[PDB]
Amino acid sequence: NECISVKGRIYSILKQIGSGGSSKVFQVLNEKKQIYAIKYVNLEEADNQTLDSYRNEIAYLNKLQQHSDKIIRLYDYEITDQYIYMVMECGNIDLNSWLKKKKSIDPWERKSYWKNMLEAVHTIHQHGIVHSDLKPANFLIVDGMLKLIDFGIANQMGTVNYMPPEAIKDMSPKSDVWSLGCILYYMTYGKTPFQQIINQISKLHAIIDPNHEIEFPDIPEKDLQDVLKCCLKRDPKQRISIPELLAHPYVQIQ
Numbered sequence: 001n002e003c004i005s006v007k008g009r010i011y012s013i014l015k016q017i018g019s020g021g022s023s024k025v026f027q028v029l030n031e032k033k034q035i036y037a038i039k040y041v042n043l044e045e046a047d048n049q050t051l052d053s054y055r056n057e058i059a060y061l062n063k064l065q066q067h068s069d070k071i072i073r074l075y076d077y078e079i080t081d082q083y084i085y086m087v088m089e090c091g092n093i094d095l096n097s098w099l100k101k102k103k104s105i106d107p108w109e110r111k112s113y114w115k116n117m118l119e120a121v122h123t124i125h126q127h128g129i130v131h132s133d134l135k136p137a138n139f140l141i142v143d144g145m146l147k148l149i150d151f152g153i154a155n156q157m158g159t160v161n162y163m164p165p166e167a168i169k170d171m172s173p174k175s176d177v178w179s180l181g182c183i184l185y186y187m188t189y190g191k192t193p194f195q196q197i198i199n200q201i202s203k204l205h206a207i208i209d210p211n212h213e214i215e216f217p218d219i220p221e222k223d224l225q226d227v228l229k230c231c232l233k234r235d236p237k238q239r240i241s242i243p244e245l246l247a248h249p250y251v252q253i254q
C-alpha cells in the first residue's frame with residue numbers, strides 16, 4: 001500500500017485492481033481522497049517494438065479525449081525509461097467479468113450497452129484506428145455507461161472466440177463488426193457462436209469454413225436477430241459496417 005508520484009501530484013495505493021504481463025492496475029487516492037485508477041507498466045524487459053506499441057496507444061488515447069465520452073478518461077500520464085504511470089478514471093467492473101456474473105441481461109440494458117459499444121468503435125474508426133482484437137475485456141462500466149479502455153495497438157494480458165475469419169486467413173474496419181457481433185450474440189443467447197466447439201483447432205476451422213451454419217434461435221426482438229445475422233457474415237464484403245449499424249432499426253426504433 002505504497003505511494004505513487006505522477007507529475008508532482010501524490011497518490012496513495014488503496015487496492016490492486018489487476019495485474020498482467022509487466023502491467024498492473026491500482027485503485028488510488030489523491031490528497032483530497034478522490035478516487036482514480038493508475039496503470040503501472042514495467043519497461044525494463046520491453047524492446048523497441050513493444051515500446052513503440054505503448055507510445056502509440058498513449059498518444060491515440062490522449063488525442064481521443066473531448067472527441068467522445070465512450071473512451072476512458074486519461075487525466076495525466078508519466079513516461080520514463082523504466083516505467084509508465086497512467087492516471088485514469090476509476091470504473092465499476094469490466095464487461096467480461098460483468099457478463100460472466102450476470103444470469104440474464106435486460107433487453108433495454110443489452111440495447112444501451114450495444115449503442116455505447118458501436119459509438120466507441122465508430123470513434124476509433126473515424127481516427128483511422130482498427131482494433132482487430134475486440135473482446136468484452138476491452139470495455140469498462142463507468143458512470144452508468146460502457147467505455148473502451150484499449151485500442152489493441154499494444155500487446156496486453158474469451159480466448160479465440162471473438163477472432164474474425166479475415167484475421168485467421170491472414171497468415172479492414174469490418175473486422176471489428178464480427179467481434180462486436182459475437183459480444184451481442186453472447187448478450188442474446190448466453191453463449192458465444194463457437195463456444196460449444198471446445199477444441200481450439202476445430203474452433204478456428206468452424207469460423208473460416210463456409211456452410212458451417214451458425215444457429216440463430218427465434219426471439220421476440222426480430223430487429224436484434226437481424227443485427228446478429230448481418231454482423232456474423234464470413235465474407236467481409238457482405239458484412240454490415242459500423243455506420244450502417246448505427247442506422248439499423250435495433251438502435252434507432254423504440
Ligand SMILES: NS(=O)(=O)c1cccc(-c2[nH]nc3ccc(NC(=O)Cc4ccccc4)cc23)c1
Nearest residue numbers: 018019020023024037088089090091092093094
Ligand atoms: N471497481 S474497481 O475499482 O474494482 C475496477 C474494476 C475493473 C476495472 C477498473 C478500472 N477502472 N479504470 C480502469 C482503467 C484501466 C483498466 N484496465 C487496463 O488497463 C487493462 C489491464 C488490466 C489488468 C492488468 C493490466 C492491464 C481498468 C480500470 C476498476
